[PDB]
Amino acid sequence: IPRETIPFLHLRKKTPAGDWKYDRQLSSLFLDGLEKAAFNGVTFKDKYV
Amino acid sequence: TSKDIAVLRSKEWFQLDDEDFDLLNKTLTFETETEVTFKNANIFSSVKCFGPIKVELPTKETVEIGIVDYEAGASHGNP
Amino acid sequence: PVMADLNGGLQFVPELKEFTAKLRKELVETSEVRKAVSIETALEHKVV
């Protein structure tokens, strides 16, 4: 992830103002799970949906 | 509640060894003894009310915390 | 189109929910107690 640089899949985060802005770290681990979700895949065992 | 421990701490005979104590969800017992000197059949002239104040533990084995010491004159009852 | 923020700044003072819950949850205590103290003391004054 470059700096000043937003990916295509980001999560967000709120400020005391009332808005939602791009975190990096927070939105940086959503993706390790994905890359993980892609080479190894995720399970959903025991869920109930 | 917590507005009761205040009216208590509002008091002058409700004194303890440490006001620091936590007085919520606690159960207290008052083994008080009263002495009094009269001047009429109703109108007292001197009133002592002493006795420990004890607290429930999670065992309910009561224990001493503070002391009552109420002093008064010309009373018409026991507060 | 436009938008008018006629708020005095109450989007800055944060976590306002309990910030407010408190401001009044104090009054009730500071108020209720003095409804309790005032009466028992008066009551006290009535037995002696």
UniProtKB/Swiss-Prot annotation, chain B:
Transmembrane segments: none annotated. It comes from the Eukaryota. Belongs to the fungal fatty acid synthetase subunit beta family. Present with 91800 molecules/cell in log phase SD medium. [Alpha(6)beta(6)] hexamers of two multifunctional subunits (alpha and beta). Fatty acid synthetase catalyzes the formation of long-chain fatty acids from acetyl-CoA, malonyl-CoA and NADPH. The beta subunit contains domains for: [acyl-carrier-protein] acetyltransferase and malonyltransferase, S-acyl fatty acid synthase thioesterase, enoyl-[acyl-carrier-protein] reductase, and 3-hydroxypalmitoyl-[acyl-carrier-protein] dehydratase. This is Fatty acid synthase subunit beta. It comes from Saccharomyces cerevisiae (strain ATCC 204508 / S288c). The lineage of its organism: Eukaryota, Fungi, Dikarya, Ascomycota, Saccharomycotina. The gene is FAS1. The chain holds residues 1437 to 1515 of 2051 of the full protein.
